Amino acid sequence: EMEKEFEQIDKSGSWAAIYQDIRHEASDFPCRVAKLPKNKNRNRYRDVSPFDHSRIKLHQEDNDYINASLIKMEEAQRSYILTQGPLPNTCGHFWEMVWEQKSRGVVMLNRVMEKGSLKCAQYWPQKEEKEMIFEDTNLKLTLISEDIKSYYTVRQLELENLTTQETREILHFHYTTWPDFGVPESPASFLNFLFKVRESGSLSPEHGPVVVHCSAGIGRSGTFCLADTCLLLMDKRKDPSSVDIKKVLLEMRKFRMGLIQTADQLRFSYLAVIEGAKFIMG
Numbered sequence: 001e002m003e004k005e006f007e008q009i010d011k012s013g014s015w016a017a018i019y020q021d022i023r024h025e026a027s028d029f030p031c032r033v034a035k036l037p038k039n040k041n042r043n044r045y046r047d048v049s050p051f052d053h054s055r056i057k058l059h060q061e062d063n064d065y066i067n068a069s070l071i072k073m074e075e076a077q078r079s080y081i082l083t084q085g086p087l088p089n090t091c092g093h094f095w096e097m098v099w100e101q102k103s104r105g106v107v108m109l110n111r112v113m114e115k116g117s118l119k120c121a122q123y124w125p126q127k128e129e130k131e132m133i134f135e136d137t138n139l140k141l142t143l144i145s146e147d148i149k150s151y152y153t154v155r156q157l158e159l160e161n162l163t164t165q166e167t168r169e170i171l172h173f174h175y176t177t178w179p180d181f182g183v184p185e186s187p188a189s190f191l192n193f194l195f196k197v198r199e200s201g202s203l204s205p206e207h208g209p210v211v212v213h214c215s216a217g218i219g220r221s222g223t224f225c226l227a228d229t230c231l232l233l234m235d236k237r238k239d240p241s242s243v244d245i246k247k248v249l250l251e252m253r254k255f256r257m258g259l260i261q262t263a264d265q266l267r268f269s270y271l272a273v274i275e276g277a278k279f280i281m282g
């Protein structure tokens with residue numbers, strides 16, 4: 001079970017140790033492309049790179065690099081593109097990826113500024129009348145409308161391929177209340193955010209993978225993907241409590257390094273799942 005496992009681990013101050021076990025067991029693959037000198041300025045952090053085998057390739061012939069990894073969960077039959085918060089010079093690449101991968105939704109789990117520094121570039125327009133044009137990738141982005149709520153904001157955006165004049169609707173799911181330090185006391189708001197994403201169909205098969213990101217695209221992004229996949233898995237199994245979240249994180253890490261960066265995010269993940277399951281069945 002995972003319910004009791006939480007018990008055993010929690011009332012034993014074992015989280016820190018469990019997390020370390022994962023780190024030690026986690027997969028390790030080459031990130032050659034990410035380390036090429038010409039891509040140095042396409043990476044926010046020198047210690048956070050995508051494995052070559054699962055990296056997303058931009059369809060351009062100049063440089064197909066972008067710091068983004070395709071996490072492909074076979075059993076749960078769900079795919080996610082985890083990426084770093086874009087940089088002032090990679091916003092065009094970012095939206096090019098959304099277009100090419102036919103993504104329907106973009107999930108943001110951080111704020112543009114946190115701790116007095118920029119953790120992500122302002123990659124989307126804040127005003128309907130002030131659209132954005134990414135000349136390098138020939139794309140136009142317009143803010144159609146947004147619904148601001150207590151712990152998160154949902155925006156309707158229009159992305160247009162200026163080259164073909166084709167347009168699409170992208171939904172921006174911005175969790176705006178992640179705490180300055182640690183993790184949310186309760187996963188309730190986080191769960192509602194997730195369900196809201198699910199409801200839109202952004203995580204469904206008839207669309208490309210959702211694009212998920214925070215700053216490095218491994219920590220908060222990891223809790224989101226881990227929670228979703230675990231919840232979905234419990235829906236497909238005869239024995240829901242057989243789902244081993246640690247096993248799921250380890251599988252996920254085969255596609256992108258460092259998913260879930262602290263014992264806290266790991267614990268929060270268990271919480272989100274455990275609670276999410278109860279809510280779904282009442």
Ligand SMILES: CCCCCNC(=O)[C@H](Cc1ccc(N(C(=O)C(=O)O)c2ccccc2C(=O)O)c2ccccc12)NC(C)=O
Pocket residue numbers: 045046047048119182214215216217218219220221257258261262
């Ligand atoms: C993959 C190995 C990670 C090695 C550690 N590296 C780091 O922490 C950082 C990159 C880096 C990685 C992960 C982060 N991070 C993330 O959730 C994330 O943006 O992925 C967090 C890590 C620990 C605790 C909290 C958070 C959080 O934001 O809630 C970061 C959050 C803010 C700023 C940077 C971050 N590297 C450098 C050079 O500063």
